[model samples]
Target: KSLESINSRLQLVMKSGKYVLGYKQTLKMIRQGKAKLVILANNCPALRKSEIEYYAMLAKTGVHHYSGNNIELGTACGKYYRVCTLAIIDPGDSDII
Candidate 1:
């Protein structure tokens, strides 16, 4: 899916109050072995990205750059912004999946 579509879905998820932001949450998701892919904003703090990347690597999940941050995604998706990264849980192992 395009970044715009992904952002739109994420915005809805955030509004439900189930989505939380922080290194702990990110790491927790990674360590739980539930994530299949991770999308990191290019403008996110380097430290955070590095931390998440470390955990992602350990978890054997794929990571990609979004080329945009919360603000950018929000604007593109027409919704309020909060998270700079998104994790895709339950993504199958296939490269095209």
Candidate 2:
């Protein structure tokens, strides 16, 4: 599992990149084909995953199945709340590309 890399990458994105947080907003980004990459928390709901996956496929965005849960992902992003999904629109200084 790339949990270590996930944590560091998430922090770097928050520092320099532009991203859309949460399931609802992320879907809009994906459908608009503006999201370059999508990250899903390990414990995200199955229904949400299926819907997100479909949009990501149509948008041709890469998806990273994060090994951590929503809470852990939120912590990695330096947020106080849980994050079930996120869409990275700009990678900036990170090598996530």
Candidate 3:
């Protein structure tokens, strides 16, 4: 998908109450097989992204870096900054939608 497409989809997901945050909750989602792809803001807190990266690797998923910060993403998505990261449960695994 193009960056614009991703930006739009992420906006919807961020407003959908499904975006996961916090170290424990994020980790829980990964460990429970709820996430397939993870998107981390380039400006996110280092420790937070690091933790997510560590767990994402264990979950064998892909992690992407976007150019927006937490606030920018939230504003663009019309949601709270609490939804810092967007996780896709099944990325690039299908051709039919």
Among the numbered candidates, top TM-score falls to 2
Residue-wise lDDT of candidate 1 within 1-96, one digit each (tens)? 444434444445444323334456667878898665676777778999998899999999887676677677546434566556766554333232
The pairs that clash in candidate 1 are none
Model 3, runs deviating above 4 Å: 1-5, 12-22, 90-97
A best-first ranking of the candidates according to their TM-score comes to: 2, 3, 1
Task: Write the candidate numbers in order of decreasing lDDT.
Answer: 2, 3, 1
lDDT agreement of model 3 with the native: 0.65
Give stretches of model 1 more than 4 Å off.
1-22, 75-79, 91-96
- What are the RMSDs of all candidates, in order? 5.3, 1.6, 4.2
Instruction: Name the better of 1 and 3 by TM-score.
Output: 3
Write candidate 2's Cα lDDT for 1-97 as tens digits: 4435667777889999999998888999998888999999989999999899999998889999988899999998898999999999999888876
Q: For model 2, state the Cα shift of residue 31 in Å.
A: 0.8
Which candidate number would show the highest lDDT if scored against the true structure? 2
Per-candidate TM vs. native? 0.63, 0.93, 0.67
Candidate 3 clashing pairs, residues 3+ apart or interchain = none
> Counting only residues 3 or more apart in sequence or on different chains, how many pairs clash (N, Cα, C under 3 Å) in candidate 1?
0
lDDT of 3 by residue, 1-97 (tens): 4444356556545544354654566678887878766777767788888888988898887776667777776565576654466666543322211
Q: Give the C-alpha lDDT of model 1.
A: 0.63
